Design a protein around this ligand. Structure first.
Ligand SMILES: O=C(O)C[C@H](Nc1ncnc2c1ncn2[C@@H]1O[C@H](COP(=O)(O)O)[C@@H](O)[C@H]1O)C(=O)O
Ligand SMILES: O=C(O)C[C@H](Nc1ncnc2c1ncn2[C@@H]1O[C@H](COP(=O)(O)O)[C@@H](O)[C@H]1O)C(=O)O
Ligand SMILES: O=C(O)C[C@H](Nc1ncnc2c1ncn2[C@@H]1O[C@H](COP(=O)(O)O)[C@@H](O)[C@H]1O)C(=O)O
Ligand SMILES: O=C(O)C[C@H](Nc1ncnc2c1ncn2[C@@H]1O[C@H](COP(=O)(O)O)[C@@H](O)[C@H]1O)C(=O)O
Lengths: 456, 454, 454, 456
């Protein structure tokens, strides 16, 4: 069978292919080839523009334009030609070199310096810079924007539900109340920490030959400062320089990048699960779309579930790459090549999940009635504030007395109030206690939500 | 950009797409829909054949033939129709139900009972049996044949190199000799153990309604023994019955299946690495093809790229296989839907493995043992004869053997030492007759006896 | 600070030390040394009993008894002596060899053949058989008994709660009813499958010299059939023979063993989480002990801490078990020594599991089903009867059943709907007679039939 | 059997117990209890010193000293008493509270405010700050110092072996040369990047009650700014403040801390493996200790192997904690409690490995003779520089000609020189080529080593 979204083995290009189309121009074989061509062309241009390298004279405006067009217009047909050349070479980067030599053969000025294409380079000089550009593009244009949407989404929920009381659950059991909004705010804050971290991760690149010592460069041009040339080239591409490497860029920064993405994904899994649970408890209802089919009565939180499942898959891939890539035998073994063709896979599962969560979030409808009704059936949670007040005014064995009263026992409002009336506390504090309810015993939850904007 | 092999995000459908084409008819959404159709059709057929279910009379030969053609000829076009319907329902199994109702509308016999399509079934009754069929098909038609190729490949190398001596390396250091063949035989034996295990793994399936108690079935047909009906149906599909489940089949067998595949893959990683090293030591050279380029900048290179490709994909395969094995069997209460999207990846872990198996086989086809180097290295490591000398000395009670050797080298040297030993000439001769190259123990016979085990 | 339960870095030897004391005589360094001694002793005993090995005459009854006592009475003191010797050799197995030579020096019969202790053996010949004995002992005496306790525990809960109805939750939402007992039976069935599997896992052992070819053995005793000698020895220890290995036993069976334990643990995590949730929903209350404190600040709390402790340790157990399973079977060439230190952790993964099993059993002992809540919740979810109504309507050809229900609730309501259906009174009555509480399908009978399967 | 290093189930407290003794006073149950007592005492002292909280008057010098002594002298006997109290409570932090109330009963000024011990606190307020102090102590006093030793060790090797030629291996095959020192330098640089990152990881702490909203605090003292009180307290302990949490500190920073440790461990695994290989190739010999026993002839790199094995174990634990800890049901489930008792386990395996590598490094003895001899048998590596020079001076099909000459062929010095003599290149460049050898074709390797000090 020919490949189509229906026949694709992986759902990243299959069922959810439409959800990750942006990655097709980045992490696919076409994307890799597109970036490699960009790097190869920029290298030749630097050689030409470098005065000390006279064998490659400065290019005329038309030649530079022709080279820039090769880069800018790089097409699927172009990639197919490279793939056809690779049939012969069984070496993908050599095929890219030959492809560029073909494209250039018709331009005298360019054909004349044809043998300077890939001059002194090792395949990894091209590959690592391509990987850097792929990751930087994905982070800056795709990953961070979804993260910002998720953060803003969570913040909107926090504000929207800032004062809606919630019977908290610790160890799964009814506990000291909070607000739906505060619970959303905690998540936004954690996501923001990771956002900052991902944005600060260094994206490294190198260019130094076969094993990292500019051997071939120096052999031919011993008068050129290749170490400086390298730093200038990598930085000219918008990549940070990694001066010490073997044949490969060591990949530590990819682990750094993927580790932070996995941490964010982990926070999201925690979120997907919590919301699934709030929905299970009927604290939220879900909007329904006419014609759709959810047992004819059910409305399932499938969006959060789809996200949760894909986040687990995403992390499985990202962490394998993070832990396996930085280990390469001696000056390098080639096991990382095929693995690096999966940079987009881990990211793809994540993107699918981000969109699913956003879709699920858009359907949320808070059930204030149930939230309040549940709270009203759990007056035992007032045992904490009562005992804490007792401790303040020196009443003996406060925690112990409240434990005897509520642990494993059902106590309604009248029973809790009956207990308060029997305490030897100042009249004022006595009334203050009888005035609280599980619904209003929310501490600083609301102000906490309102102050979120002052952080980060 | 539109999806194509060149633009595919995953290399399983991209660069290596042509290496896993068989999986496109199994684990893809087309494959899932195809098997779902098979299951729905067989379910209706069983209802018809069941005499106690009079509302679905037995089907005549032509109608059965029409239903069988729906199953056997299921096309991408049919799959596309289901996807079109799903755009309305936002429910894939329900779309399959509607697709079938549409397909049988022209046959009055079938159209008359179209409402019994999916009767009393919950979506997972259809999904789990589809996953079982997908995994069974993959195992019997795809995975096991590659494993047999690898095993036979290794056995061929064992036989071919049965008597080629090798300076063994323990802790990476020169050690007691073996033969290339024996080292290959060790791998084939391990692969065979896993082969037998994968073949013995149970592939489970269930059918019992919404939460596993046949509630709906019993409500409409309380006189029918649905528990028996369930067992017969699952077994009729060639799947083993799992009588106790919630809404979902628990997935324990998927972990069992994936665990054995991962163990085999680990054995293969060990092989890819060891051979990579034998090539590094120049114990093996590799066949080359004119026109091919070993390296872009070092023209003299011939790299073991096939083994490295294999090794890399095996690590990836295991990472995915392991995640599915550990995550799938945990589902909240009577089930949460996180396993649905995850099960669309059953073929991903398998795909990386298939790619690796083909790469290893390609690497194996290029190996050219280098006897000259193997023998020359052995001839410069006579120190390995310290072991047999020490053991013989011990047999005859010579004091401090381990010490006299550990303390105290070429042939002449080792020859001088032996001569000065208090041993009978016959034994001295036997020791003076051995060389690193022939101090291979039972290596050759071990290879010849391999065929006698599994 | 000196090591004690309070200062131990790992909680397996620290806080939970008393929960895994049986493992201290198995997987610890004392345990490893103990088994190494057993193996070395049995090896010497076999040499003696072998008629072709005349340099080691058959041992008389008292000497055999002295050797057996060395094995059976091995103490921490003996272990300490070995460690003292190891300070000189920086080689643990060699220290064991010296320890034994010291121990038999007083018996002339044994002292006369002390040089044959460890004859022709490589350290791993001793280590692998020790690991096999350690794992077999752990499986048969420790792991399987806890698994039987869990399984029987779950079966007891299934029987005890066989007819207690439950509002099932799929995707966390109210769904077709089941019974608490049936949900427990599902778990016991899954645990049983893994129990049978762990019991069937092969525990392999080998003995064949430096690199697996009996080089040293054949050099000294070329007339002895060491391949036969090897098989007899390993099987005499109650271990299954692995005829093809390098210096090390490949460790594939350890992965097989750990994979089944991890699958069982995963089933248990699923159980710990589900029960945690049933307690959260108040379907179960928990027994309390006077004096105990549920929470430091919320006096009303009764937390499912036993299940949570279990769940946490199971995740840890699997992480370690999985690392050993995937890492141990890969060893450079004829072996690298990275597996040595790693195998000192065989008991770590197992220890976390044991702690978890005990915590779950403790949690189970405190459960008190809350029928009142379970029934009250069911009585507020009549919408679940939409399923059976729809299926009956379908049986009798009423058009658009799924639609009339999906589109269109308490008892009276559901009762009004049914009354307006074109069905025979007999069927209307059957539908009007069901309630969420009794719409449990075959749940009860499924529980009663469990005993009939495995 | 009683617990001893011989009977311990885990080798962290068993065979290698002596290698991690520093962790016994930090991550063990004693350490956890020691830190909890510290936090509890500091909290009571802040309450007393806070003017607005009159029910807890400023403490006299002797009272403060008595409290400080409880903290400073905390002993194993003290921990045992807590463990004995825990027999009753089946709640470890409540036992700590009761323990402190007992210690204080004999001091009137302190006994008088006994019920303010643990005032308004939830167990996690004590636990998370204890975890923060444990990790900060381990990082600053134990982890970073071993990392510095490893970095300095690698740098010493780089300088020591700066000009020793090495036949590089890419894909395991002979390639463009480098120097032993340069290969060591690459590793030091990578380790330094992680060192910087670990040192910059935030160690977070919080204190805000049952579910994170100061409910109990505000119930008793609505006039006190508890949000400010919280920030002051956490910072007073030398911990960075985390203002938004549920009952638990979310643990994202632990994942951040462990992710960087795992990356460092991964670089070390790569190092242990590479050295194992250099030793296999006889590029290094190993020093031997009289009396020790290594087949009587062998000397095995057991130190690097022991390290490699423990690094894998370390990462297995660290990453499980990193990925599992930040996911907690609703306002928290208690599965993290038992897991956090293993913070020292992952670190312990790492420490064992660091010491093993250092031990192995101390035994290294470079084999210059073999390194040079091997290089002299691989003149084919000069194909790269020859073709690159040919490309410079416009000689047609340079790479192709060298490929025909060397790929899959054995070419000695005379053969390579014979080829150079036949090239149409300027006399000067012709001699330059005939002057190079595999041993001197090391590019910028030496200067690269010498310039390492200018980075970081
Ligand atoms: O400048 C060079 O090329 C230097 C060279 N090392 C290599 N570096 C990068 N790529 C290389 C290398 N070698 C091969 N190849 C080619 O990489 C392609 C790999 O295929 P895949 O496993 O499918 O990802 C596939 O096309 C391989 O042929 C060396 O000899 O060290
Ligand atoms: O038998 C039933 O359908 C009842 C049902 N539960 C379900 N079981 C199985 N599939 C279901 C279920 N619910 C939805 N869906 C549909 O599954 C699809 C999930 O899509 P994806 O996340 O992309 O894998 C997507 O098409 C979903 O609509 C329940 O509510 O208990
Ligand atoms: O049969 C032999 O001993 C020969 C041998 N290989 C070895 N096989 C097994 N153990 C060996 C080996 N070598 C050392 N050792 C000793 O193992 C111990 C390793 O200590 P640890 O890393 O703490 O687990 C530690 O005590 C080590 O000294 C070889 O060189 O091929
Ligand atoms: O302020 C509180 O205590 C509040 C409370 N939550 C808890 N937070 C922290 N620890 C708690 C909690 N609950 C129990 N425990 C006790 O923790 C101890 C856990 O044991 P282990 O599994 O061995 O690590 C063990 O001693 C447990 O009893 C809540 O109800 O949410």
């Amino acid at each position: 069978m020919e490949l189509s979204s229906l026949t694709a083995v992986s759902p990243v290009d299959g069922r959810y292919g439409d959800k990750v189309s942006a990655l097709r121009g980045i992490f696919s074989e076409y994307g890799l080839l597109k970036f490699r061509v960009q790097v190869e062309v920029r290298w030749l241009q630097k050689l030409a523009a470098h005065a000390a390298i006279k064998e490659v004279p400065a290019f005329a405006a038309d030649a530079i334009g022709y080279l820039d067009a090769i880069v800018a217009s790089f097409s699927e047909e172009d990639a197919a030609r490279i793939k056809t050349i690779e049939r012969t070479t069984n070496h993908d980067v050599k095929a890219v070199e030959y492809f560029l030599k073909e494209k250039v053969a018709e331009i005298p000025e360019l054909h004349a310096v044809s043998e300077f294409i890939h001059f002194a380079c090792t395949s990894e000089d091209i590959n690592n810079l391509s990987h850097a550009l792929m990751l930087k593009t994905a982070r800056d244009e795709v990953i961070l924007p979804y993260w910002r949407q998720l953060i803003d989404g969570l913040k909107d929920l926090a504000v929207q539900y800032r004062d809606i009381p919630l019977l908290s659950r610790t160890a799964g059991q009814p506990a000291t109340p909070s607000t739906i909004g505060k619970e959303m705010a905690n998540v936004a804050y954690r996501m923001e920490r990771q956002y900052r971290q991902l944005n600060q991760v260094e994206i490294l690149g190198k260019i130094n030959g076969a094993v990292g010592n500019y051997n071939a460069h120096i052999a031919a041009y011993p008068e050129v400062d290749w170490h400086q040339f390298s730093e200038e080239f990598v930085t000219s591409l918008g990549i940070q320089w990694n001066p010490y490497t073997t044949q490969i860029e060591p990949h530590d920064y990819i682990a750094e990048l993927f580790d932070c993405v996995a941490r964010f994904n982990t926070i999201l899994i925690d979120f997907d699960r919590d919301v699934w649970g709030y929905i299970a408890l009927n604290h939220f209802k879900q909007k329904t779309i006419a014609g759709e089919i959810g047992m004819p009565h059910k409305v399932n939180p499938i969006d959060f579930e789809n996200s949760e499942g894909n986040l687990g898959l995403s992390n499985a891939v990202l962490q394998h790459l993070a832990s396996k890539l930085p280990v390469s035998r001696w000056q390098r073994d080639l096991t990382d090549s095929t693995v690096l063709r999966n940079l987009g896979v881990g990211i793809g599962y994540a993107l699918i999940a981000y969109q699913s969560t956003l879709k699920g979030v858009s359907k949320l409808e808070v059930n204030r009635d149930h939230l309040l009704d549940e709270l009203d059936h759990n007056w035992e949670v007032l045992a904490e504030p009562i005992q804490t007040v007792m401790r303040r005014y020196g009443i003996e064995k406060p925690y112990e007395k409240l434990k005897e009263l509520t642990r494993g026992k059902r106590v309604d409002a009248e029973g809790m109030k009956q207990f308060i009336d029997g305490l030897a506390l100042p009249e004022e504090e006595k009334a203050r206690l009888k005035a609280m309810t599980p619904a209003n015993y929310i501490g600083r939850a609301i102000t906490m939500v309102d102050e979120l904007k002052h952080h980060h």
